[PDB]
Amino acid sequence: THWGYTGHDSPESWGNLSEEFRLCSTGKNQSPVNITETVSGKLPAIKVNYKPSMVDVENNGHTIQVNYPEGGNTLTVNGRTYTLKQFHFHVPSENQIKGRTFPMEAHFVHLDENKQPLVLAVLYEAGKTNGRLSSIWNVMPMTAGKVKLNQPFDASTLLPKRLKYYRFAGSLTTPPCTEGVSWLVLKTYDHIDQAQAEKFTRAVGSENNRPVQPLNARVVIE
Ligand SMILES: [Zn+2]
């Protein structure tokens, strides 16, 4: 089923495009969200074990996505090991902090041994060109192709040294909007400029931000 961000197949309508996508409109624990009022808690520390890897960079008509065929890029939180499957971007950002939208967001998608999904989100402020991302922007496909990459990538560059985060439960932000996703949104912002954000938008065809969804019964832990 075709879905998008404008016209007849836009996010207000994803619920109705298919029975498969129903949770996009009926779900009560949907992402993204506006993080406003939080409960202060004692969150387990994130340990990151990313390394130079071979990755496949994909334009899927909705996002630019960097795929990890092999394991070995992991993140450990509360003594569970989550494997990095792929990361990708939204321009502008999807999640908000006290109403604030950022020029871009990256979502680092992981699974643990029990198939439990975990997304780590970096938010990018307006600032200087991102050097560490240039490697991806240079090979970024501008149609539904894939670049197999005798170019490696080290994703550890894309994460800050300060790994303080917000924690909540939620969903995929694209159909079928599956719930049961753990969300960890890092408090420390990276940077991009307008020319990188506009280049992403050219490639992907549109702005790919789903509107914020109500928290309902969920608490955000900071
Ligand atoms: Zn995403």
Side-chain angles (χ1 to χ4, degrees), residues 1-18 20-112 114 116-149 152-193 195-222:
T1 321
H2 301 321
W3 60 265
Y5 291 96
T6 67
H8 294 16
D9 62 347
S10 79
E12 57 171 290
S13 314
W14 293 346
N16 299 140
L17 301 190
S18 156
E20 196 93 24
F21 294 174
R22 202 69 202 105
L23 201 54
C24 297
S25 70
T26 71
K28 297 288 166 66
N29 304 87
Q30 290 285 287
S31 303
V33 300
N34 185 21
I35 302 162
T36 49
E37 52 199 304
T38 60
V39 164
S40 164
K42 282 158 195 179
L43 288 171
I46 301 169
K47 304 222 149 183
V48 37
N49 319 282
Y50 292 175
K51 42 140 206 130
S53 304
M54 304 310 301
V55 303
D56 305 303
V57 179
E58 159 195 28
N59 190 322
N60 66 13
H62 306 295
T63 188
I64 306 309
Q65 182 170 125
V66 178
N67 297 289
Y68 286 78
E70 301 281 69
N73 293 262
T74 70
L75 159 175
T76 302
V77 52
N78 198 201
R80 276 156 198 102
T81 300
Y82 296 85
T83 299
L84 178 66
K85 314 314 294 164
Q86 55 96 347
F87 69 85
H88 63 263
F89 304 88
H90 299 278
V91 171
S93 83
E94 288 208 296
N95 291 295
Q96 301 175 335
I97 314 283
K98 294 223 157 85
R100 185 175 164 196
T101 307
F102 300 74
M104 183 167 86
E105 178 162 9
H107 291 164
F108 296 75
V109 179
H110 309 78
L111 290 182
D112 76 351
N114 302 300
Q116 284 298 135
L118 180 156
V119 180
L120 174 66
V122 175
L123 295 150
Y124 302 76
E125 289 178 312
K128 58 178 158 79
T129 315
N130 194 299
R132 287 157 293 126
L133 278 184
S134 54
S135 176
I136 306 310
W137 261 234
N138 178 235
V139 299
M140 176 184 296
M142 317 292 299
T143 24
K146 288 102 281 190
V147 201
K148 277 84 277 316
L149 210 62
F153 187 74
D154 192 4
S156 58
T157 64
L158 291 191
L159 292 201
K161 274 147 226 145
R162 301 110 89 200
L163 295 172
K164 285 257 288 173
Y165 59 108
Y166 305 100
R167 167 79 167 82
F168 58 98
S171 69
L172 299 181
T173 67
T174 58
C177 306
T178 318
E179 284 179 1
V181 178
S182 300
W183 279 84
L184 283 73
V185 182
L186 291 180
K187 300 204 203 190
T188 304
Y189 309 147
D190 201 347
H191 57 256
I192 32 137
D193 64 1
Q196 291 178 304
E198 285 168 347
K199 183 171 157 46
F200 177 85
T201 298
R202 255 196 288 304
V204 161
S206 75
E207 287 164 4
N208 59 340
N209 55 317
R210 180 189 196 195
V212 291
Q213 311 293 303
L215 277 158
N216 295 325
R218 296 175 288 176
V219 176
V220 182
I221 310 178
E222 69 99 50

